[PDB]
RNA sequence: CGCGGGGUGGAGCAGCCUGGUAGCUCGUCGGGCUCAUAACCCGAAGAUCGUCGGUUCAAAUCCGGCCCCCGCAACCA
């Protein structure tokens, strides 16, 4: 007899390179046939974090290795006595593409220890695949459990095939053992193999909330320009999506950074500070700021300043060392074994005197001057004003060839 | 029934100014519409720049300019009070 | 009255408040180095701002009607 109920926290999502079998995974076990069927929802835009409560259950008679499921009991091993439940959990997810990759991080909000679905049909290098590894890999989810999806029928060598290169990839580096699971989400054939591979979870213990994080803002439209009438001004609320932990209703006390406002030779970008009136959750709003797609946080704006994508790369940090031009930059780097540009595999030059590289902190990419060669550390000056919070950080670093750009590796600044 | 040129450049200094406009909406702006009779609406709309073409629409043609001018004068008076510079070039 | 970047020499552009000089980072023939040059020495080159009417002392810059692209844009084989 089992009916205890204990510790149903820590939800888990699935992301990857575009159409890697994510949506079908978050919907993988839901309904039967009548109504409540297929996948996703009526709106394909990023939205609706949780799938809420997910049935995860098993039987007694039928054996453990090959058996776990949502739909009541099992008609495969027969029906005699009531089945046993596992736990109460949601299923989250986030989109990504050339444009939408960022959502990954924020989509990891309700997603702790996401389950990872790699490809089978598509080959390993893809822009947002390695982008997925070198970006997401630092987010703190080692609970990623690799699941090869997207394979229907071929000469059956395909399975172990998708196992090979992955066997070469991880485990010889950061991110210790990650389970790799063969499945077809396509045809609903072979799902039990995805649960029998996924049941494991990562080691590190963590807490609930009350810390010092920073959310980043996201997409929203710039509401009707004054052309009708000066009316239709609620301020033009615009809003973002959270990544790390939180507290309460309070969101924006400070808009960091802010407008150039010109001023002679050296121009500083000056921030604007306000308390929160709005915070849109959806068709109707919320008290706190919910991640996903279009959200609208109270910002009082005549339809000018909002800069509908005139100034891209929405940037948000907290506090500052307080001076509109503050430049001292000491970075201990790492980079990579070899350099990674466009498709090319040939090496690119090491450290030379006064070379220029992209020092990009957050959603800004700022001109930076690698200058002093410290050996494996460097000093890199910036132009446009920006504020880092702590030594912990990941600097995105690129290379200059004829108006073009190539990302060459990583480093971290130490304050 | 004549549309007008009506394009000026306004500026307001304070950060609360964004809301202060609604404060003095609750206080200042009233009755200017009914200063005359038989109009449609009142509007302030950008030239795609910090310049705004405004609008006052009615059947009586000439008064347009008159009224138009008055609306400008508002910010002017507001300027003589609230530090609001309606000045274009 | 919910559509968003745009197109100011063949890659990115704060051009449309400052009504009529025009490139930061591209590609090329002619000289190139009594040491190899993707680091550059000589920016030679050629001006329809994509249709348009109007306004016009002229149009790179406007209201509208025509638009071919990317659209929900950062750790981009
Ligand atoms: N290239 C490719 N697409 C496939 C394959 N099997 C299914 N699809 C497509 O996957 C689509 C569903 O995409 P979607 O589920 O939104 O993507 P996803 O797989 O969840 N990942 P994400 O949404 O995050 O990109 C369907 O239109 C279906 O045709 C396959 O083997 N190869
Ligand atoms: C593509 O060029 C690729 N080598 C970049 C990441 S390594 C999989």
CATH number at residue B26: 3.30.70.1130
φ, ψ (nearest 5 deg) of residue B80: -70, -5
Quick one: which of B79, B86, B13, B7 has its CA closest to B43?
B7
Contact B43 A303 (CB under 8 A): no
Domain count, chain B: 1
Chain A, chain B: beta-carbon pairs less than 8 Å apart: 32
CA–CA separation, A145 and A198 (whole Å) = 6
What are the DSSP E strand ranges found in B1-89? Answer: 7-9, 11-12, 39-46, 51-58, 84-85
Please give the annotated binding residues of A for Mg(2+), written as ranges.
Answer: 19, 23, 44, 46
Q: What's the token pair of residue A323?
A: 């001076």
CA–CA separation, A413 and A278 (whole Å) = 35
CA–CA separation, A159 and A157 (whole Å) = 6
The three-state DSSP-derived secondary structure of chain A is CCCCCCCCCCCEEECCCCCCCCHHHHCCCCCCCCCCCCCCCCCCCCCCCCCCCECCEECCCCCCCCCCECCCCCCCCCCCCCCEECCCECEEECCCCCCCCCHHHHHCCCCCCCCCEECCCCCCCCHHHHHHHHHHCCCCCCCCCCEECCCCCCCCCHHHHHHHHHHHHCCCCCCCCCCCEECCCCCCCCCHHHHHHHCCCCCCCCCCCCCCCCCECCCCCCCCCCCCCCCCCCCCCEECECCCCCCCCCCCCCEEEEECCCCCCCCCCEEECCCCCCCECCCCCCCCCCCCCCEEECCCCCCCCCCCCCCCCCCCCCCCCCCCCCCCCEEEECCCCCCCCCCCCCCCCCCCCCCEEEEECCCCCEEEEEEEECCCEEEEEECCCCCCCCCCCCEEEEEEECCEEEEEEEEEECC
Q: Are strands A147-148 and A117-118 parallel, antiparallel or unpaired?
A: parallel
CA–CA separation, A178 and A198 (whole Å) = 10
A47 CA distance to ligand 1 middle (Å): 18
What is the 8-class DSSP label of residue B60? -
Q: Taking a C-beta distance cutoff of 8 angstroms, is the pair A237, A297 a contact?
A: yes
Deposited resolution, Å: 3.2
Q: Identify the domain containing residue B51 by its residue range.
A: 1-89
The domains found in chain A, sorted by start residue, are 1-207 (3.40.50.300), 208-319 (2.40.30.10), 320-415 (2.40.30.10)
CA–CA separation, A114 and A140 (whole Å) = 10
CA–CA separation, A272 and A281 (whole Å) = 23
SS3 B1: coil
Q: After which residues is chain A broken (C to N over 2.5 A)?
A: none
CA–CA separation, B73 and A360 (whole Å) = 48
CA–CA separation, A359 and A350 (whole Å) = 16
Of B15, B43, B50, the CB nearest to A230: B43
Work out the angle at residue A87's Cα, subtended by the Cα atoms of residues A81 and A92, and round it to the nearest 5 degrees: 130
Strand C contact nucleotides, protein CB < 7 Å? 1-6, 11-12, 14, 16-18, 25-27, 38-39, 62-63, 71-77
**Candidates A19, A93, A100, A152: which one to mutate for ligand 1, based on the most atoms within 8 Å of Cβ?**
A19
CA–CA separation, A17 and A19 (whole Å) = 6
* Structure determination technique employed: X-ray
Rg for chain B (alpha carbons), in Å? 13
Q: Give strand letter and number of the nucleotide nearest A313 (CA to C1').
A: C74
Q: Taking a C-beta distance cutoff of 8 angstroms, is the pair A350, A364 a contact?
A: no
Handedness of CA A288, A292, A296, A301 (dihedral sign): positive
């Amino acid at each position: 007899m089992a009916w205890p109920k204990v510790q149903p926290e820590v939800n888990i999502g699935v992301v990857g390179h575009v159409d890697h079998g994510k949506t079908t995974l978050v919907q993988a076990i839901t309904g039967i046939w009548t109504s409540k069927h297929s996948e996703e929802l009526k709106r394909g835009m990023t939205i609706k974090l949780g799938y809420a409560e997910t049935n995860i259950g098993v039987c007694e008679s039928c054996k453990k290795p090959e058996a776990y499921v949502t739909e009541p009991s099992c008609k495969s091993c027969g029906s005699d006595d009531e089945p046993k439940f596992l736990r109460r959990i949601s299923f989250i997810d986030a989109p990504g593409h050339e444009v939408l990759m960022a959502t990954m991080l924020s989509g990891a909000a309700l997603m702790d220890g996401a389950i990872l679905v790699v490809a089978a049909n598509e080959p390993f290098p893809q822009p947002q695949t390695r982008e997925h590894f070198v970006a997401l890999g630092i987010i703190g989810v080692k609970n990623l459990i690799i699941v090869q999806n997207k394979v229907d029928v071929v000469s059956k060598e395909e399975a172990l095939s998708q196992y090979r290169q992955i066997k070469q990839f991880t485990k010889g580096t950061w991110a210790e053992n990650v389970p790799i699971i063969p499945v077809s989400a396509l045809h609903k054939i072979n799902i039990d193999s995805l649960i029998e591979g996924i049941e494991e979870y990562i080691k590190t213990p963590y807490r609930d909330l009350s810390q010092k994080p920073v959310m980043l803002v996201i997409r929203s439209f710039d509401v009707n320009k004054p052309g009708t009438q000066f009316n239709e001004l609620k301020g033009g609320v615009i809003g973002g999506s959270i990544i790390q932990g939180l507290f309460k209703v309070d969101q924006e006390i400070k808009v960091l950074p802010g407008l150039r406002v010109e001023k002679q030779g050296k121009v500083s970008y000056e921030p604007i500070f306000t308390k929160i009136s709005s915070i849109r959750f959806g068709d109707e709003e919320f008290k706190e700021a919910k991640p996903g797609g279009l959200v609208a946080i109270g910002t009082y704006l005549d339809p000018s300043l909002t800069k509908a994508d005139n100034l891209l790369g929405s940037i948000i940090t907290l506090a500052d060392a307080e001076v509109p031009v503050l430049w001292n930059i000491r970075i201990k780097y790492n980079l990579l074994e070899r350099v990674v540009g466009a498709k090319e595999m040939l090496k690119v030059d090491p450290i030379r005197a006064k070379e220029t590289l992209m020092l990009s902190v957050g959603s800004s990419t700022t001109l930076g001057i690698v200058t002093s060669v410290k050996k494996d550390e460097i000093e890199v000056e910036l132009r446009r004003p920006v504020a880092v919070w702590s030594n912990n950080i990941r600097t995105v670093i690129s290379r200059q060839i004829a108006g073009r750009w190539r990302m060459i590796g990583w480093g971290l600044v130490e304050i | 029934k004549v549309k007008m040129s009506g394009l000026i450049t306004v500026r307001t200094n304070e950060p609360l100014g964004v809301e202060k406009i609604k404060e003095v909406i609750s206080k200042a702006l009233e009755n200017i519409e009914q200063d005359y009779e038989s109009l449609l609406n009142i509007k302030i709309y950008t030239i795609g720049a910090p310049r705004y073409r405004v609008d006052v629409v009615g059947t009586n043609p000439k008064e347009a300019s008159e009224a138009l001018n008055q609306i400008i004068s508002n910010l002017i008076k507001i300027g003589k009070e609230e530090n609001v510079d309606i000045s274009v070039v």
